[PDB]
């Protein structure tokens, strides 16, 4: 029932477990957020997303502002009613996908203009318009509009981009705050930049803390630097952020990356023929599964593993059948939610370090 309340129930090292309370529901942390692109978590009904244990989903902004359009979604009642998900939704700012999926983008201090990847339509995106679009969609957790930094990045370019990002973070803060219904009902997260440079991460964290946000993302990672480098940067970056607010690592979702990131103080993650299993991923298209009657994973509690075999799913995926996508997706998102649950429980019980060890021994065996 409050607009936003993050409470930490238990800790182990840098790891934390707790809850974020919002108007539309409670979010258990560490949290994994399935991703909705074009107002759908691909191949799943929202009731099925919920059934896997998800407390919140991410809505990509870029595709919705192109199709079906933010204004139209607002006229139709907002994203939650449009897609039939009534729990929190975190929306991205749209900047990532502009720069990664759009064309003829022209960047400047005001923002970015671009042509979409689908048509030739002209479009504009600034801190102000991004916050507006997230409002029109009815987002619960709004992300500040930033300027991401390619990897690798020179210190000068990483600095310029981080600085611009902090200027846009203030503009984001003010746009959000000047819209009463959004300010009163949603939350706003700021994004830390700085590439792999500690001094720049520090300056960014300081700037963001000065402005003040409900949560802080670590942006700029998982863009080519490798897990070792990513963890090294997290080692010094996450402590710079306010302890008492949630920490979201953008673009990170491999099971092992999630475990090590939680070990480094991260609280929120998203979804980035592969099936996850506690013994490591499998590619279900491999011929070795064509007569395998076992479920995708031997322990998994999901409906898919209760009800269908590897052999059947192998057949469906090789045949390009939609049910194959449906089943593979339900299992994988369930597997991630079970990972998060095991993480939450082990932290609450002060045995997370052990969990991490055990998980890795078997997942890479």
| Binding stretches for ligand PRF (CB under 6 A) | 92-93, 95-96, 146, 148, 191, 219-223, 250-251
Taking the complex as a whole, the smallest distance from the CB of residue 9 to ligand PRF amounts, in Å, to 28
Neighbouring-strand partners of residue 90: 58, 141
| Footprint of a copy of itself (CB under 8 A) | 38-40, 42-45, 67-68, 72, 75-77, 82-84, 290-291, 293, 307-309, 311-312, 315-316, 318-319, 321-323, 325-326
Q: Is the CB of 8 or the CB of 74 nearer to a copy of itself? A: 74
Residue 302 binding target from ligand PRF, Zn ion, a copy of itself, none, CB below 5 to 8 Å by type: Zn ion
Q: Is the CB of 204 or the CB of 332 nearer to a copy of itself? A: 332
Taking the complex as a whole, the smallest distance from the CB of residue 130 to ligand PRF amounts, in Å, to 10
Whether the CB-CB separation of 241 and 205 falls below 8 Å is answered with: yes
Site for Zn ion in 303-362 (CB under 5 A): 304-305, 331
Taking the complex as a whole, the smallest distance from the CB of residue 101 to a copy of itself amounts, in Å, to 14
Q: Half-sphere exposure of residue 334, counting CA atoms within 13 Å on the CB side?
A: 23
Whether the CB-CB separation of 270 and 261 falls below 8 Å is answered with: no
Q: Where are the alpha helices (DSSP H) in the chain?
A: 46-51, 61-66, 70-75, 79-83, 95-101, 127-137, 155-177, 180-185, 198-211, 227-237, 255-262, 303-307, 310-318, 322-348, 352-363
Could you say which of 54, 268, 302, 327 contacts Zn ion (CB under 5 A)?
302
Chain CA centroid to CA 102, Å: 20
Residue 43 binding target from ligand PRF, a copy of itself, Zn ion, none, CB below 5 to 8 Å by type: a copy of itself
Q: Measured between alpha carbons, how far is 232 from 216 in angstroms, rounded to an integer?
A: 18
Residue 331 binding target from ligand PRF, a copy of itself, Zn ion, none, CB below 5 to 8 Å by type: Zn ion
């Amino acid at each position: 029932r409050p607009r936003f309340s993050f409470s930490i129930a238990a800790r182990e090292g840098k790891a934390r477990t707790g809850t974020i309370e919002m108007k539309r529901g409670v979010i258990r942390t560490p949290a994994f957020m399935p991703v909705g692109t074009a107002a759908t978590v691909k191949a799943l009904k929202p009731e099925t997303v919920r059934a896997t244990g998800a407390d919140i989903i991410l809505g990509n902004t870029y595709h919705l502002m192109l199709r079906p359009g933010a204004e139209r979604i607002a006229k139709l009642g907002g994203l939650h009613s449009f897609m039939g998900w009534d729990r929190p939704i975190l929306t991205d700012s749209g900047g990532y996908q502009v720069m990664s999926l759009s064309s003829l983008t022209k960047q400047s201090e005001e923002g970015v203009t671009f042509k979409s990847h689908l048509d030739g339509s002209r479009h504009m995106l600034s801190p102000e318009r991004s916050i507006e679009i997230q409002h029109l969609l009815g987002s619960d957790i709004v992300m500040a509009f930033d300027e991401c930094t390619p990897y690798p990045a020179t210190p000068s370019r990483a600095a310029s981009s981080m600085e611009r990002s902090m200027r846009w973070a203030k503009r984001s803060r003010d746009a959000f705050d000047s819209r009463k219904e959004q300010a009163e009902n949603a939350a706003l997260f700021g994004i830390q930049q700085g590439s792999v440079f500690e001094n720049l991460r520090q300056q960014s964290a300081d700037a963001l803390a000065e402005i003040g946000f409900d949560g802080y993302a670590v942006g700029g990672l998982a863009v080519g630097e490798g897990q070792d480098e990513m963890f090294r940067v997290l080692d010094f970056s996450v402590p710079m952020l306010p302890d008492d607010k949630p920490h979201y690592l953008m673009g990170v979702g491999k099971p092992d990356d999630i475990v090590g990131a939680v070990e480094r103080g991260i609280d929120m993650f998203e979804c980035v023929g592969q099936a996850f299993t506690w013994d490591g991923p499998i590619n279900i298209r491999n011929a070795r599964f064509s007569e395998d009657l076992k479920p995708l994973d031997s322990e998994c509690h999901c409906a898919v593993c209760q009800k269908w075999s590897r052999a059947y799913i192998h057949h469906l995926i090789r045949a390009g059948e939609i049910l194959g996508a449906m089943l593979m997706t339900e299992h994988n998102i369930a597997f991630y939610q079970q990972l998060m649950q095991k993480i939450r429980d082990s932290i609450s019980e002060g045995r997370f370090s052990q969990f991490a060890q055990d998980f890795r021994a078997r997942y890479f065996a």
